[PDB]
Amino acid sequence: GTSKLKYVLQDARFFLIKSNNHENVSLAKAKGVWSTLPVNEKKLNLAFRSARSVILIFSVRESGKFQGFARLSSESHHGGSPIHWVLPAGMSAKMLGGVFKIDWICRRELPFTKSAHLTNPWNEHKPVKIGRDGQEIELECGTQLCLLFPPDESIDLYQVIHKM
């Protein structure tokens, strides 16, 4: 069903995450972690304290798809288990410092063709697929977007609900 998912998304905040490669999204799916640039890290840390749920919706550049979505379970933390992110040009491990823990809600893909009816008020009402890494997605648009994804029957939202 979709009732627990709707409960997790109630009064949530949503942010678009753009990754330059699939490798980092695969690593994030396997390890339950994400790292972003310091400008976005500050925004996510502020959002984490402000809302019952902060949802990251992931899209790999040039893929034409979203690769899933996840809920922040912590603010960013430094030190500890390092992450072998595949770093683009100019990208360094020090900028990808600060690791957030995340709980995946859906690890399935959604093609951009399926979200063409959803526009984001916080990005000039452009289609929600359009946006820089870190772009906030307004509540109603983000909720509809998450509900478009195929259900991920490998995930039990019971443990997610308890963290709220």
Swiss-Prot record:
Substitution effect: R132F: Reduced binding affinity for N6-methyladenosine (m6A)-containing RNAs by 9-fold
A molecular-function term among this protein's GO annotations: N6-methyladenosine-containing RNA reader activity
Location in or out of the cell: Nucleus; Nucleus speckle
Gene Ontology biological process terms from the UniProt entry: dosage compensation by inactivation of X chromosome; in utero embryonic development; mRNA alternative polyadenylation; mRNA export from nucleus; mRNA splice site recognition; mRNA splicing, via spliceosome; post-transcriptional regulation of gene expression; primary follicle stage
Modified residues (Phosphoserine): S81, S92
Described function: Regulator of alternative splicing that specifically recognizes and binds N6-methyladenosine (m6A)-containing RNAs. M6A is a modification present at internal sites of mRNAs and some non-coding RNAs and plays a role in the efficiency of mRNA splicing, processing and stability. Acts as a key regulator of exon-inclusion or exon-skipping during alternative splicing via interaction with mRNA splicing factors SRSF3 and SRSF10.
Protein name according to UniProt: YTH domain-containing protein 1
The organism's taxonomic lineage, starting at the top: Eukaryota, Metazoa, Chordata, Craniata, Vertebrata
Underlying gene: YTHDC1
Full-sequence range covered: 345 to 507 of 727
